[PDB]
Design a protein around this ligand. Structure first.
Ligand SMILES: [Ca+2]
Ligand SMILES: [Ca+2]
Length: 279
């Protein structure tokens, strides 16, 4: 398939070169996979989700995304226009309030929720969790991410937007999950993107156009935005059978565009998520 005039991030993940505008991807498009978007919720009624998005869990008075962050990342995972895996099922886990903040215990609970809730869902092609959230280091948040990964969920987490070594942030620093840095459309590391040895992959993170609440769209930046690219990519690849949840991060790293990013600090991987699709 070929989506012309796609968001640059989508075009980038299907390109060996920057600066193209068409997103290429196998038409299976992640059908049969599921992606949990652990964030501020998902405006499931957004026409861009085509009925494939639903709130499965909230820890606040409403499952509504009154923030937009989670709708935006869910859109990058699997919305029809702005999504990597345009046929995946999107499950919203609102661990962040509408101010985009959530206690670590809530975040941990939501991660443990997903590890269990996937047994209530039909995801024969596999389960992904997109964690576009970050805070200071926490062995308990890391262990919850590790448990989620261990349970058979491909966990993609944001490296963080502190322009710092992600070793001091959670769940970014958890080794067993896929820690995602941000790049821009000129294949530069996003100025805000965390880095370090714990980073597994870079995805498009600067000026990422996707869905927003109120049935709208908007472009925002963050490793929070690169994560759904990798999460959507994992779901896409798992649907293709090219990898499993346990090995998707390694597979994405192996098949990534290598050495194409600039301003990657010494010791950080120079890997850009790449669907390796040949039309
Ligand atoms: Ca987003
Ligand atoms: Ca890792």
């Amino acid at each position: 398939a070929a989506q012309t005039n796609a968001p640059w991030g989508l075009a980038r993940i299907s390109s060996t070169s920057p600066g193209t505008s068409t997103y290429y991807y196998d038409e299976s498009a992640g059908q049969g996979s599921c992606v949990y978007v652990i964030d501020t919720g998902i405006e499931a009624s957004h026409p861009e989700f085509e009925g494939r998005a639903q709130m499965v869990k909230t820890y606040y008075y409403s499952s509504r995304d009154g923030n937009g962050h989670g709708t935006h990342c869910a859109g990058t995972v699997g919305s029809r226009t702005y999504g990597v895996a345009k046929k995946t099922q999107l499950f919203g886990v609102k661990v962040l309030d509408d101010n985009g903040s959530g206690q670590y215990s809530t975040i941990i609970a939501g991660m443990d929720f997903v590890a269990s809730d996937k047994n209530n869902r039909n995801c024969p092609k596999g389960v992904v969790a997109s964690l576009s959230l970050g805070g200071g280091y926490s062995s308990s948040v890391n262990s919850a991410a590790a448990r989620l990964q261990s349970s058979g969920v491909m966990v993609a987490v944001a490296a963080g937007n502190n322009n710092a070594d992600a070793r001091n942030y959670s769940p970014a620093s958890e080794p067993s999950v896929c820690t995602v840095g941000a790049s821009d459309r000129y294949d530069r590391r996003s100025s805000f993107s965390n880095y370090g040895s714990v980073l597994d992959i870079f995805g498009p993170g600067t000026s990422i156009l996707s869905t927003w609440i109120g049935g709208s769209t908007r472009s925002i930046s963050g490793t929070s935005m690169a994560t759904p690219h990798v999460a959507g990519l994992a779901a896409y690849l798992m649907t293709l059978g090219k990898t499993t949840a346990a090995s998707a991060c390694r597979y994405i790293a192996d098949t990534a565009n290598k050495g194409d990013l600039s301003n990657i600090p010494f010791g950080t991987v120079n890997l850009l998520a790449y669907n390796n699709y040949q039309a």
